[PDB]
């Protein structure tokens, strides 16, 4: 219904199409991964997450296979992010 439309469709697209999203986290870090499930609070079960950040001005990252993310930590979520190596 209105998971289907309404802002939470961004999330239900990744579930439907196994698409990665990029999440800006209150961390000051970014998470790139596939969504497994989510709730209205944007609590999240993620897979294959790449956590990425910069700091001393060097890019940093880490991999987390399986994550539960509290919706609390999420700031913005990009549908169809664009990343490069």
């Amino acid at each position: 219904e209105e998971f289907n439309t309404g802002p939470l469709s961004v999330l239900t697209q990744s579930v439907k199409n196994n698409t990665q999203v990029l999440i800006n986290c209150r961390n000051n870090k970014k998470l790139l991964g596939r969504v497994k499930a989510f709730d209205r609070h944007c609590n999240m079960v993620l897979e294959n997450v790449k956590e990425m950040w910069t700091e001393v001005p060097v890019n940093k990252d880490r991999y987390i296979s399986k994550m539960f993310l509290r919706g609390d930590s999420v700031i913005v979520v990009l549908r169809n992010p664009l990343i490069a190596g």
């Binding site: 709730d39 079960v45 399986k66 539960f68």
Partner: protein, 81 residues
């Protein structure tokens, strides 16, 4: 929020938790409450500039949690039902 119902199914799984201060807390789940308060045992805490800390038990406020690193082997599809 349905998804905590998931965390509630995780007793005895050992997890690592990132706190909002950035601490990492490894431990085994005795229980998770409906507000995400998590009780751990056999705990190790890694801190930015302080040696690790071992604790027999610890319990952490749901709103101090940024995320749970789950065990790779965890089977998500059965837990999500």
């Amino acid at each position: 929020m349905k998804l905590v119902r998931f965390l509630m199914k995780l007793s005895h799984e050992t997890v690592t938790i990132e706190l909002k201060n950035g601490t990492q807390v490894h431990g085994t789940i005795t229980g998770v409450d409906v507000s995400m308060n998590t009780h751990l045992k056999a705990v190790k805490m890694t801190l930015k500039n302080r040696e690790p800390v071992q604790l027999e038990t610890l319990s952490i406020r749901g709103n101090n949690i940024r995320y749970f690193i789950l065990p790779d082997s965890l089977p998500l599809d059965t837990l999500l039902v």
